[PDB]
Ligand binder design. Structure first.
Ligand SMILES: Nc1ncnc2c1ncn2[C@@H]1O[C@H](COP(=O)(O)OP(=O)(O)OP(=O)(O)O)[C@@H](O)[C@H]1O
Ligand SMILES: Nc1ncnc2c1ncn2[C@@H]1O[C@H](COP(=O)(O)OP(=O)(O)O)[C@@H](O)[C@H]1O
Ligand SMILES: [Mg+2]
Lengths: 502, 467, 187, 128
């Protein structure tokens, strides 16, 4: 055998008693930096998972408190660390700044602003290694989280506190759905009722830094940044930073959840966190598993996605939604990580790639997409419409494998509905316009339009109702349900508009 | 500071400094060789010893030789005098033309541009090639990926991109030959000398070749793409201009990384690749971006092992690619050169928010007509031309005309076809295709367009060959 | 870490690390010779039946062994360096290979004072006048200052001549190897 | 020796997939870290620094030459194994032999579909 603190440079200090001069209860010396981990000697008073600070300004956290030398993961590039450097405690479990002083800022995985707009002047520091709310604090998911996308709001409704899952092959429309959901909250974030305002957090993990820069620019182009945080552990950043980024974001969101406000965190994407964690492990010699992922690449996500809860009135009534993104490989949604995360969340949104090639954007595959919990949380107008839209599409999907006029009718209905469900990009529509268009579609009025022409009808229709009939939409929204008189109106308006469209 | 070697295990040396260690990634000179042996630190093993990966053959090293610490990572010359030269990974010329006399030096290990530097507007790099600039537009500071094998005109396309970028955008280029066969390295050198991108007489060369041969130890095939990146970062930063960067190949970059990781003893990852595959690729693909000073485009050849597009190497590369250019053999039999396939070539910026509505509608129309013609090809082959109506024969005629018009005569390829090089600007390509689709030229013989530049030259060729 | 003065010879393994530490610490404070004296003393002091029996049982609490070593090292009145080294070995649990340490340290001190190992394996018994000429000629190989520590060995297994080792340098003029060399060459 | 003495040589290794196995044994016994299929990390450097001596010197270095025809055995057409791909990405061609063709009666059992040479038209006489 041998030892790791049994080196000459240490045994000499100990032999001639010189250790009385250098502190070891509050300061250590890096025995060896390698493979992104530093074996550090000293730090007798370091708590597990404390956040120690190196002598180059770096920062790491102590994982292994081996009997003779701590083991420290460096949140950065070890290029800057040299055997012999002095590591100092900080007496604080690894934590991150929180508050509303972060809103509109870009911060790296540790809360250090990287947009060059000055320090994050926050007061509260919240741990990252916190526990999720227990059984009792939570209650069911009741309010809706308006996505602003026709398909998501109609067929895969999302509540608040519900962990969704945007899972689908790369270059399919996942980041696009996230950006639509983040821009669609502008309307709610310009009122007074704190029951509606939703503060968004976007964690960009292992994602090209140019892409995150363009995303921030696109958000600020729509003043959807005054209320968003953007945590960024991009591709270049050392693996430990890509490992903490989701926990930093989830803590910055828990700060809201615990204070009666509603947040919405988008991990983009957890698969790259899992890859970074596998790197971190295999460089610590830990055993590999299935696909070389460590044994605990499930207690890596669960302890993160279990914090996206829905507090009850006793604890504040807060919330923290979550929309983890996942990039399946070619078509396998049975791989290790897609399955490990499909069994942690309360829903799924499958973005098929064939649909995306065939021009059906968003590519949301229905049938494979469910929201087990969102049905209880859905505006009753959208329920009055979806209850039948889902049925019509379900019937259509059976007759899509092949006729008498019955199946021709069903095919026509299905094609019309799917042609409606397409949508642009960065153009989310309030729920009232969604009910208007989906109603005018499901109730057959578009049966007499050439399929390709629906793609235009919708557009025009929106304008005609965004101006002429503000009052009807106002009544629908305020009452939340299509009142029978409101149904009669919507009917006569759709008929009149359809009359002379061509 | 002078350490001493204490172990030589294969291509992994271990040096024992005393006074003060070199931080990771420093380059050490091994004293007492005749060929410059350069080690690069990779770990600290405690006890004032560092495990260095050697950048050249380590036969003849003696436990106890003196290793002198340079002070900063591998440093290379990066002036404009590195243009038209060949230089190995450590920056030593291997063209037998003398020293690379430059006043600047740059370290090959420099961190990626900070977030504030990054430019937020996705532009389009006008390559001057009709098919590329139309269906798969190349983006400034985007990592293009050039599929396709040999025999289909890949070196010619590289030389043409170099020439066109040097003329249009007035920006130089680079060529990092990761694991580059020595025979093909010499052939590429002489091809460039022929075509004139390299020029031995006047110092007006447009390429700065960099070759990490296929026989140099693995530690010196991983750090050659970084040498190319540094030579090009000089042009982006210190001269504010657009740049190309061809990394042939980008699978041998991951292969070299995997071999080095195995040598350092690290546990292998999913498929035997290094545990740091994603970050190793990231810390090199993340310097290829458009800052505000300039930009570094990059055309990276890709090998897909066993046609596995899920394999961790081509699955980690594709997370960065911003384009694609599937050179195909089936399109070279027809003689349509470049062989670029129009229906496989993707591009992330082919979106009407970026290129513009006109560009996008035209490109999508071309794609749709070509798909429809490919489908009708099957019906014609099976049953016969009779089976088609004129509502289809018109699309067939238009598709044949478009397939012709995509071919272009390259300037460097004058030796083959004799035709003159045509650098058709973007607007001319758009107008030509928008018009050929509008039926405006349904009467001209197809050979009017074959191997022409703009559409006007196609009109002139029709007039000439029609008399 | 603090600069340390390397030994003249390098020994490797556990004993290597401990001996290097002790030698570098002793070079500072210049206590090398008395350190070697105390090392030899602890040699025997760790061979008394009770001590050598209680320092092998693993069921003697570690602190018990450390305190017993401290008490013994008060009676023997060792230098601070040697007492600290004995302690160190005690609580790291590596005292079972204390003889390896001191032995290595001896080899570390011998080369420090410059007494290169030697050896002369002879075909058979040897005179002592021949040994005189042997020493007087081998002294021709050293550097300026070194000393010769020749350990003769009789060997009839070889045929004739002799085998001389000096540090590493190995010169073989035994008739046996000449015979096998000739048979090899003319086969 | 011939190559740099202005002569023309030709060297046929048979097999190289047994030099690779011998080197794997040498390494695994020296305790060097293993890799895919247990081969060390040098099993590419191994071959590459060999099959890159096969050159065709110019007329200033003599005009010599040294062809190379490494023979490789693939386990049931598994061209994707480690060594077959290591040595397929170093060389300028491949003459693929198959046993469906050897028993149909097409002997030598060369499979012109998969066999390629990356010099091509050159390296032939104008007649051929
Ligand atoms: N609803 C839509 N309509 C039209 N185009 C879309 C839509 N959604 C996405 N796209 C286009 O798809 C392309 C890729 O989209 P996106 O940025 O979502 O990729 P992704 O699914 O996030 O995968 P990656 O992580 O590689 O970006 C973009 O060019 C974008 O313009
Ligand atoms: N624009 C072009 N016009 C005519 N022929 C071309 C053109 N581009 C490529 N080719 C043909 O394709 C071949 C390409 O060979 P080369 O570029 O040397 O290697 P690779 O085949 O790998 O690209 C050339 O021999 C040439 O005949
Ligand atoms: Mg994305």
């Amino acid at each position: 055998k041998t030892g790791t603190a049994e080196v000459s440079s240490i045994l000499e200090e100990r032999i001639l008693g010189a250790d009385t001069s250098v502190d070891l209860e509050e300061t250590g010396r890096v025995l060896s930096i390698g493979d992104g981990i530093a074996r550090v000697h000293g730090l007798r008073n370091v708590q597990a998972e404390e956040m120690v600070e190196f002598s180059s300004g770096l920062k790491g956290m102590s994982l292994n408190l081996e009997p003779d030398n701590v083991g420290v993961v460096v949140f950065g590039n070890d290029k800057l660390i040299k055997e012999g450097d002095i590591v100092k405690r900080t007496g604080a479990i690894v934590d991150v700044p929180v508050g509303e002083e972060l809103l509109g800022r870009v911060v790296d995985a540790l809360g250090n602003a990287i947009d060059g707009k000055g320090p994050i002047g926050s007061k509260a520091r919240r741990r990252v290694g916190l526990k999720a709310p227990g059984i009792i604090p939570r209650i069911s998911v009741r309010e809706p989280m308006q996505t602003g996308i026709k398909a998501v709001d109609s067929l895969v409704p999302i509540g608040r506190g519900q962990r969704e899952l945007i899972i689908g092959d790369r270059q399919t429309g996942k980041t696009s759905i996230a950006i639509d959901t983040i821009i669609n909250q502008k309307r709610f974030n310009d009122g007074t009722d704190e029951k509606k305002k939703l503060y968004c957090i976007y964690v960009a993990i292992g994602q090209k830094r140019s892409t995150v820069a363009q995303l921030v620019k696109r958000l600020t182009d729509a003043d959807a940044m005054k209320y968003t945080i953007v945590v960024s552990a991009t591709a270049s950043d050392a693996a430990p930073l890509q490992y903490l980024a989701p926990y930093s974001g989830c803590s910055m969101g828990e700060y809201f959840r615990d204070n009666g406000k509603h947040a919405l965190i988008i991990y983009d994407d957890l698969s790259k966190q899992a890859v970074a964690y596998r790197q971190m492990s295999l460089l610590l010699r830990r055993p590999p598993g299935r696909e070389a992922y460590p044994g605990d690449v499930f207690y890596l996500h669960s302890r993160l996605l279990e914090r996206a809860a829905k507090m009850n009135d006793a604890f504040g009534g807060g919330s923290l939604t979550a929309l983890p993104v996942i990039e399946t490989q070619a078509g396998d949604v049975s791989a290790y990580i897609p399955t490990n995360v499909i069994s942690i969340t309360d829903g799924q949104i499958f973005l098929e790639t064939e649909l995306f090639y065939k021009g059906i954007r968003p590519a949301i595959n229905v049938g494979l997409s469910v929201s087990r919990v969102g049905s209880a949380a859905q505006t009753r107008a959208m329920k009055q419409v979806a209850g039948t839209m889902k049925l019509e599409l379900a019937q259509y999907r059976e007759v899509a494998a092949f006729l008498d006029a019955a199946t021709q009718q069903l095919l026509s209905r299905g094609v019309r509905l799917t042609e409606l469900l397409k949508q642009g990009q960065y153009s989310p529509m309030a729920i009232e316009e969604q009910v208007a268009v989906i109603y005018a579609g499901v109730r057959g009025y578009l049966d007499k339009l050439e399929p390709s022409k629906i793609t235009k009808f919708e557009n025009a229709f929106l304008s005609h109702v965004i101006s002429q009939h503000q009052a009807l939409l106002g009544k629908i929204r305020t009452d939340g349900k299509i009142s029978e008189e409101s149904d009669a109106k919507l009917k006569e308006i759709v008929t009149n508009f359809l009359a002379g469209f061509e | 500071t002078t350490g001493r070697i204490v172990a030589v295990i294969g291509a992994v040396v271990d040096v024992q400094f005393d006074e003060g260690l070199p931080p990771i990634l420093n380059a050490l000179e091994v004293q007492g060789r005749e060929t410059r042996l350069v080690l690069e630190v990779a770990q600290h093993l405690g006890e004032s010893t560092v495990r260095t990966i050697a950048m050249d053959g380590t036969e003849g090293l003696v436990r106890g030789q003196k290793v002198l610490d340079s002070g900063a990572p591998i440093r290379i010359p990066v002036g404009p005098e590195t243009l038209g030269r060949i230089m190995n990974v450590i920056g030593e010329p291997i063209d037998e033309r003398g020293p690379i006399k430059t006043k600047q030096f740059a370290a090959i290990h420099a961190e990626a541009p900070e977030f504030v530097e990054m430019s937020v507007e996705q532009e389009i790099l006008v390559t001057g090639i009709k098919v590329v600039d139309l269906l798969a537009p190349y983006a400034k500071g985007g990592k293009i990926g050039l599929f396709g094998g040999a025999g289909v005109g890949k070196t010619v396309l590289i030389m043409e991109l170099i020439n066109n970028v040097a003329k249009a955008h007035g920006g130089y280029s680079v060529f990092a030959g990761v694991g580059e066969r020595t025979r093909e390295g010499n052939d590429l050198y002489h091809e460039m000398i022929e075509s004139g991108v390299i020029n031995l007489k006047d110092a007006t060369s447009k390429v700065a070749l960099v070759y990490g041969q296929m026989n140099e130890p693995p530690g010196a095939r991983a750090r050659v793409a970084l040498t190319g990146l540094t030579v090009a970062e000089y042009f982006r930063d210190q001269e504010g201009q657009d740049v190309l960067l061809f990394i042939d190949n980008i699978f041998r970059f991951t292969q070299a990384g995997s071999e080095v990781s195995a040598l350092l003893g690290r546990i292998p990852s999913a498929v035997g690749y290094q545990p740091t595959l994603a970050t190793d690729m990231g810390t090199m693909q993340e310097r290829i971006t458009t800052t505000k000073k300039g930009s570094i485009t990059s055309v990276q050849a890709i090998y897909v092992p066993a046609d596995d597009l899920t394999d961790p190497a081509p699955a980690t590369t594709f997370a960065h690619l911003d384009a694609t250019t599937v050179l195909s053999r089936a399109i070279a039999e027809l003689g349509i050169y470049p062989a670029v396939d129009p229906l496989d070539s993707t591009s992330r910026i082919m979106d009407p928010n970026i290129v513009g509505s006109e560009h996008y509608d035209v490109a999508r129309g071309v794609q749709k007509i070509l798909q429809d013609y490919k489908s009708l090809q099957d019906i014609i082959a099976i049953l016969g031309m009779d089976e088609l109506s004129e509502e289809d024969k018109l699309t067939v005629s238009r598709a044949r005309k478009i397939q012709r018009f995509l071919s272009q005569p390259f300037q460097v390829a004058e030796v083959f076809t004799g035709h003159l090089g045509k650098l058709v600007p973007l607007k001319e390509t758009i107008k030509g295709f928008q018009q050929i689709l509008a039926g405006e030229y349904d009467h001209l013989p197809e050979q009017a367009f074959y191997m022409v530049g703009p559409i006007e030259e196609a009109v002139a060729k029709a007039d000439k060959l029609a008399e | 870490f603090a600069k340390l003065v390397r030994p003249p010879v390098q020994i490797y393994g556990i004993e290597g690390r401990y001996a290097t530490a002790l030698y570098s610490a002793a070079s500072k404070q210049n206590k090398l010779e008395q350190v070697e004296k105390e090392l030899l003393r602890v040699g025997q002091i760790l061979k008394e039946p009770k001590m050598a029996a209680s320092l092998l049982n693993p069921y003697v609490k570690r602190s018990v062994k450390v305190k017993s070593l401290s008490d013994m090292t008060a009676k023997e009145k060792f230098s601070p360096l040697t007492s600290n080294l004995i302690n160190l070995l005690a609580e790291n649990g590596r005292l079972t290979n204390t003889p390896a340490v001191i032995s290595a340290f001896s080899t570390m001190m011998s080369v420090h004072r410059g007494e290169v190992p030697c050896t002369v394996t002879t075909a058979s018994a040897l005179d002592e006048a021949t040994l005189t000429e042997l020493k007087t000629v081998l002294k021709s190989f050293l550097s300026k200052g070194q000393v010769l520590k020749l350990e003769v060995k009789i060997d009839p297994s070889i045929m004739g001549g002799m085998i001389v080792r000096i540090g590493e340098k190995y010169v073989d003029m035994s008739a046996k190897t000449k015979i096998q060399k000739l048979s090899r060459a003319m086969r």
